[PDB]
Amino acid sequence: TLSILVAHDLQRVIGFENQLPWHLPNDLKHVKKLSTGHTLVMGRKTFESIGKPLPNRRNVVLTSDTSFNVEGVDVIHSIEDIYQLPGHVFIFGGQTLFEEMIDKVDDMYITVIEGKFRGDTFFPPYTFEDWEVASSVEGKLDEKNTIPHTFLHLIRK
Ligand SMILES: NC(=O)C1=CN([C@@H]2O[C@H](COP(=O)(O)OP(=O)(O)OC[C@H]3O[C@@H](n4cnc5c(N)ncnc54)[C@H](OP(=O)(O)O)[C@@H]3O)[C@@H](O)[C@H]2O)C=CC1
Ligand SMILES: CCc1nc(N)nc(N)c1C#C[C@H](C)c1cc(OC)cc(-c2ccncc2)c1
């Protein structure tokens, strides 16, 4: 199973100066729930921005750097190596990789942040004509989660 796992805002911003533009603990829990025990694939820049691999799942990084090695991180150098990955596989970031992968994945787990942030990294444009809405659940606003947001699970038609 090959999925996209992304959070973007109303204009598809997913990042600004190596950072997430927004602090939203509920989306982290959401990420932890979906991807624990499975596989996360990410481009080199996405990985360096986190700075450490995420616990209790396989971390795969795509890069052309043949010297790249990080403890707890499996390296690939080919888009094509993604399809040899066993199990449920999540394309985690960033803009470059989503652009390469958005026409290949079976489905997408999108967190829509109902805001307009300044960004420099964008999720590629997509139309609902090509995606069925399997589920749409609003996140709950509270003390620590202060931005309206929505979990979408879109499946390709
Ligand atoms: N929400 C998110 O997912 C987050 C992402 N970001 C950002 O993403 C921003 C924009 O950079 P972006 O390009 O999107 O980052 P990516 O995560 O897509 O990393 C890009 C790199 O991935 C590797 N790569 C991609 N495709 C291939 C391929 N076909 N073959 C071999 N290697 C490949 C290359 O690494 P290499 O150059 O080493 O060969 C490439 O330079 C960065 O500024 C980073 O901060 C920031 C915050 C959050
Ligand atoms: C959650 C945000 C998020 N949500 C969803 N639904 N999908 C995603 N792909 C990402 C994402 C992301 C990027 C890789 C990112 C950048 C970052 O820049 C500092 C820190 C983290 C991060 C720090 C701590 N634990 C998990 C992830 C993730």
Q: Which residues belong to the annotated binding site for NADP(+)? A: 6-7, 14-19, 43-46, 62-65, 92-97, 100, 121
- Return the CATH number of 1-157, one of 3.90.550.10, 3.30.1360.200, 3.40.430.10, 1.10.357.10: 3.40.430.10
Q: What is the resolution of this structure in A?
A: 2.7
Q: Kindly state the helix (H) or strand (E) to which residue 95 belongs, with its residue range.
A: helix 95-101
Decide: 41 in ligand 1 pocket, CB within 6 A.
Answer: no
> What's the residue count for the chain?
157
- Report strand pairing: 149-156 vs 107-113: antiparallel
Decide: 77 in ligand 1 pocket, CB within 6 A.
Answer: yes
Q: Which atom of ligand 1 is nearest to the CA of 97?
A: 18
**Domain locations in the chain as residue ranges:** 1-157
- Say which experimental method was used: X-ray
The CA R_g of the chain, rounded to the nearest whole Å, is: 15
CA distance 132 to 3: 14
- The answer to whether the CB of 60 falls within 8 A of the CB of 85 is yes
CA distance 156 to 99: 16
Q: Which of 44, 59, 130 lies closest to 95, judged by CA? A: 44
**Ligand 1 mean position, distance from CA 139 (Å):** 28
